[model samples]
Target chain A: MVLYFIGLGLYDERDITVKGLEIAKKCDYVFAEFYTSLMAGTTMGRIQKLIGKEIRVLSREDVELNFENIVLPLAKENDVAFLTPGDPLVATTHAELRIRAKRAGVESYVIHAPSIYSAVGITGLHIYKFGKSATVAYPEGNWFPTSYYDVIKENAERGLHTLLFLDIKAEKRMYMTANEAMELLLKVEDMKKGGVFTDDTLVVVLARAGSLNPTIRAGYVKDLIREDFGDPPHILIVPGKLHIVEAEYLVEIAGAPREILRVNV
Target chain B: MVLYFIGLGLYDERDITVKGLEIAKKCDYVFAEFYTSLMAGTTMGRIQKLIGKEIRVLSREDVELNFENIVLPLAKENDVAFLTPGDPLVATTHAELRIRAKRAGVESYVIHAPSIYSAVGITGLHIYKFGKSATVAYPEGNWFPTSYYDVIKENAERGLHTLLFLDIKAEKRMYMTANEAMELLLKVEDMKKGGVFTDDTLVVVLARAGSLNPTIRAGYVKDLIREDFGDPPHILIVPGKLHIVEAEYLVEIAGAPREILRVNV
Candidate 1:
């Protein structure tokens, strides 16, 4: 008896690895959750059809509170699979669930897929140069979070790139766009006066990664604040000092301006 | 006339995403190189068979010097796929190849797979807590590299975990084990006397990630320095201040000593 934590990859149903799909198809029961991140390119129906299983969708509470009651009980007697968007444990609280599995006497194995963490390499920035990551949150009536602004300041001060994960409310089907993230960062910059993010700052927008024609754009915040990134679930990157080759790639493949070759380095 | 940069995932032939596999099968020519990283769990033969293509494996020189001459030329007339271990462009210089493709008048698309960068999420560490990554290089004659040691010190000073990728000489079939990496760090510690990595330092070892039964171990360096993590292609992590949940995961899922929950936090 085993429980497999399979990632549905970054974009679509076909993004699941051959190994994960094969193992999942052989499982007696399949469960999935989408509260952490949104897969903008595919539907649950497509994934269920591809794997040929009836997927029992779980909410955030269903997983965080009653996972043992609903999922682990099935793993005690049969092979079960729990699917999640992107890499199963990255950017989610799901890694702690493995501890829950251990305590419940149900073994769990992780089958990883393409996560935006590594997929950001498609931006032509060295992954090794990325510093600690932070997420941009939606501001409430009286509470506004600005930690992500500090994160960018800290990483950029060290000449390291900062990967900013935009917030998502999957229950409400709300996905944060890169434009919204840029606006928030600019607002925070105005408040903190940290010079961390401004209209003159260079930023990269990656939307719908894992899709064939995903948008990859790099420019000043002022030039791109209102530019259409062509879908939801966008990732924003505030790169630090640029290597010569990285600048060339941004100019050539990402349609970035040639001035970046000189201005950024 | 397009070039596809496909990653063969981490472990075996089946580790490739269905999208990558399907696209590789349709490509007119398939090329791969293993000099950057080794896929210890699979063979070129198995990958070629799975993709149903006659794979031409390139050496380091062939790729760095003659990528335009050999691989890009094929993309001028037909669809071509270049496969590599892990997510394409994550750790290697392959991202620059996309620029080369643009210069050569050939279009390129990347089909990402599960990379060790993201697969480390299975190690039970918060992926966002990771700082700048560094590779532990083997010291050549008269050249002992300690930048990785400094990296650990810098990241730890900020309470961010450091991801240490061990060295590999794929052509020579030499892979630096986690034990060797630990010993080297210990030597650096002895030389620098920074008290960064010591016998009492807590560490985590993840071996052969993307494999179902891959080894995950955590404990003090003194206790685990000589312990076997099984097989090659190991990843080392020197964590900073641990969260209680992270400590609990280490204790329960990674077989870490119970003392970490009390001390590491």
Candidate 2:
């Protein structure tokens, strides 16, 4: 018996890879993690109907507590599937589960699929430029995590790209808007002592990164902070150096104004 | 008239978004930046043939020239297409160019497509865990950059995932293998006084991330120094934390041994 972990990329029901779809359809049980990321627009009911499987939804605690006792055993007894919003091992829990499952003597495998990582490629940014990806978690008790500032600063200093996965609380219909996040960064800039970030820093804010109506905005961090970007599930990009063609794409494709971001300007 | 930068995702030509394909096929003239990234198994000629456009290739210099000569007028005159191998804004040049084009009174637009950013979803590793991304440039004239060490150390210290993009020198047919890179990191560790990096840090190496037969291996940096992951267009992921579920996926799907990587282990 085996447990299969699958990633369903940026779209609806059909966005899942053929391998993932196969496992989901045949597995005796299917579990999905909606806490980290969401299916482009898929409902748990819709996913169950699409795969024709008895899908079990796992909350954050459920994954931490009974995944081994509840999920793995069933998979070992029959075929069990764990589905995620993106590719499987991209999250650490999947790896931990596999380790425990092996200890329990259950065979396991993986099924790859599309994720936001693949979605960012659509904008013609070099995959190599992107740096450590981070999330904008909920403002915990009136305070958002300031660690993201260091992360972004580290990437910018090295001229590497920073991939920011803004927070999305789907159950509550809450999303960390790109504009709000930029504002958070600005607030951090004035509040934090590191002083690594500034209002003039350049940033690229992308909304609905994997969808058809995606919005790409660019300017000084402060400029983008005040701007309006439609929708949720936005990804922020902070690039290192300006290449000629990249500059062209920003102005001509992403709708960014020139002087605010050019080197000499 | 504007430019829409598009990326043809890993695998084949058809992997391009339906919207990007539509733009590339119908734009007045299509230009692609050849220096940064390229298609996997598909040729530019094949794309030109398939899309029925006169695809002009741009050099690194062309992209860096600030779009004065090449991109400015074409965008205003007609719907010129600027195609990149990955997402557009991921590159600083594109971001700068977008600003430049808009400042010059040229309108801007984008037809997005799949890219490597979302491809990390394939691994099931939390896309948010990735730290500042690093790129490898095979030393020119007996030298490698030590700056890369700083980015790795900073991310590793914070338990963030670092995505490293390997160098690709297409005209010379030179590609840096991950084995050699891991060895370089080892060297970096040895050379720097009180450096941030240690020799035993865990690293996740990925080659051909978006390809059908992508390879990922997780182990100590020294272990990677001995293992060989073939092909160009390679990237490395240095993960910060292993949520239990993520650990399981790595084991069950990526062939990682559970006992080796889990933090709790």
Candidate 3:
């Protein structure tokens, strides 16, 4: 008996790796959790039909707290597959689940898929230039978090692009759009006054990453803050100084203002 | 007429995404290049058999110099697919090819797959902590490249992990090993005296990613320098200050020294 951590990819059901799909079809029970990230193009019905297996969906509490209780028990008797959106372990808690599986004497394997972490390459910004990443969380009651702002500041100081994962509350049906994230960052800038984020700052927004016609827009905050990127699950990128090729790409591919090509800073 | 840039994933033929494989099989012409990276676990023959396509392998020169002359011309008349190892555009020149396609009046699309960029999540290091990446190239006659060493220092100073891509000479059938990369870094350290890489410096090596039984190791350079990591295509990671969970994963999964658990620095 083995436990498989299979990633269903970024946008749809067909993005699963051939290896992952093959292993998933052999599993006796397939359990999935959409709380981590959304698969914007595909639904549970499409995923089930593609894999030819009925998928049982799990919630955040069921996965984070009772994963071993509900999923591991089945692994003891038959092969169990735990499906996650995007690459299974990247920016997710599934790694701890693997540790828990080991504590219970269960063998686990990870089947990788396309992650938004790497899918950002489609924006034509050199992926190697990206620096440490952080999540833009929705501020709560009296809990205005600003560490993500610091991450961007530090990365920008070193001329490294910062990839910000917009927050998501899957159960609440809440996903932070790029515009909302920008508004929060602007608010934080007003309080911190670090000059880390401003209305003149250039940014890139990627939405529905794994789809064929995903939205990739690049522009200054003033122009894009109100621009519609369409739908939920948007990611923001604060790029540092751009290389010549990177600037040309932004102008040609992402439709950034041609004036950015002359940005000397 | 359309052009598709599909990634073959990290290790073997099966690592390709289901979406990529489906589109690849339906293409009028399928071309690939292995110079950017190698898939050590499988051969071109195996890949062609699985995709059921008569694959035409291209050289680095073929893609870099004659892509517009050869591939673009075919795309003008029929559907063409350009396959590459790892995620199609992550660290390659394929982005420029897209620009070229635009100039040539051909529409292009990218199909993402698992890349070493995101596959490093398997090493248990938090993916978000990675910083600007650099390639470790072999030193030649009267010319030694050490810029990659500087990148490690900059990333480490910021407490961000550095992803160093080992060089490959696909024409000469040469894949730089992690041990060789370490040797080059050590030589550069001797000349630069940067206090960056030393015998006591801790590092992680990931070999044959995307394979079921890929090798993962972590330890000081003194202990791991001579240790065999098995096979070609090894990726080196110089971790900065480790998070508690990161240290634990290195210990449990990579057979790292337990003393590192208390390595608070």
Candidate 4:
């Protein structure tokens, strides 16, 4: 009579917390959705192999529209688990799902895992310096979204860093790279003429954040917009004014230009 | 040759990710610090037993002053693990420690874990709505801090929620409760006259975040200041504007007043 919202931490299946794995193993039905964000390092098969349970993968519509009809019904009489990449409630849709469970009289519990939200700590940026986060979406058909561009501008005006989550089209097997996000931002800048994003702006690109050898690079947009950051699921950070210590870390750890220590610090 | 920074996750020993636990078990030396944040649900003894290692607990001074002398020396020839509550590098001090490791020629790898930064998502607030975070400190003789009050004001001005981490004197076993934080914020409001924090301001209190039955309450500070939230290691959030769904969640799940759905939404 419980529904578990467990996060399968960043990057891989093994990233699930010990408590999460233990609870998930005993669940009578396990459902997962990878449309919000996918674990770039593992597949559904590998994850099922570890938990020793067959996971029924759900599409975005399955979760957003029929979560109450599907998962919550099973949760009425048996232990049911809904696995998501990173922390479950970080995505607002899942947070709202918990309310749906309440409406249907199903008890829902959240089991947190390592999230890209905090895993951005790997880039050596002071986590507290981060402000409002936004998502960069790939323009489709005739629609183009540029609200994320304004999000960066708002955060930067307050001297706070902005974390931009790149888009993912999970079903089509397409994930936006950091480079593509930069290109989109550059195009947006040309139309908006706000100078919010330009070739000279300092940006940080983090790839495969939870991996041991994750790539972290910081440089001007011109230099990094074309630089390969290796694999999918990349995120971009537009930092505001740099503290001296932050500048040093970007220089020493993330390979930012030594000039930034003087210019941005 | 390597130093592993493992996060014990939020609340307890079992909250650690399986990857973190597995890597920590094989470490030649295990060192932990609890001053940054603490696991309100478990103890050092329980954590030691689970990892199958005799953990050497370090003081804040020990880590800040002699981390290189103590932990790095072991990592030069052995796999040394430094454990901290929540995600390792989210704390700015730990992020700087990685720079110290780089200077000393010690390679450091971070094993991600759940952090209160992300765990706050369980409070039904959209994680993306959170802005810059601040810490509420207990004022000492002739010294007081009001910057956190400004943080809430600044975030609120932008219609962004503020995450306030309460102070903890870990060595003395004193963790500041949300009640104390509200009192301090009211005092700061009296001094600053910012009207940022008052008796009528809506606030949310989250206690023992990683626990299954953790306490979550939302209401005006006047009513909540006397409410017992059950345990130590509490966090407070001053939400800006409430979305209707967020208001409903607080009312249905967090035991908040139903009137907030009409007032704040």
Q: Write the per-residue lDDT of candidate 1 for residues B163-238, one digit (tens) a residue.
A: 9999988878988989999999999999999999999999999998999999999999999999989988899999
| Candidate 3 local lDDT, residue A74 | 93
Please give the range of 10 consecutive residues that has the lowest summed lDDT in model 3 chain B: B88-97
lDDT of 4 by residue, B1-265 (tens): 6999999999889899999999999999999999988798999899999999999999989999999999998989999999999998885468888889999899999999999899889889988888988999989998998889988998999999999989999889899999999999998999989889999899999999998888999999999999999888899999988888888888988989988989543
- A best-first ranking of the candidates according to their DockQ comes to 1, 4, 3, 2
Candidate 4 residue pairs in clash (backbone atoms < 3 Å):
none
Best by DockQ: 1
**lDDT per prediction?**
0.93, 0.67, 0.91, 0.91
lDDT of 3 at A129: 91
Which residue runs does candidate 4 get wrong by more than 4 Å?
B263-265
Higher-ranked by TM-score: 1 or 4: 1
RMSD of each: 0.9, 6.2, 1.2, 1.1
In candidate 4, position B247 carries an lDDT of: 87
**lDDT leaderboard ranking:** 1, 3, 4, 2
| DockQ scores for all predicted structures | 0.89, 0.26, 0.78, 0.82
Cα error, residue A29 of model 3, in Å, equals 1.3
Candidate 1 lDDT score relative to the true structure = 0.93
RMSD of 1: 0.9
Shift of residue B193 alpha carbon in model 2, Å: 8.2
User: Chain A alone, TM-score for each of the models?
Assistant: 0.98, 0.90, 0.99, 0.98
**What's the residue-level lDDT of A163 in candidate 4?**
97
Candidate 1 C-alpha lDDT tens digits along A105-147: 9999999999999999999999999999999999989999999
Residue B121, model 3, lDDT:
95
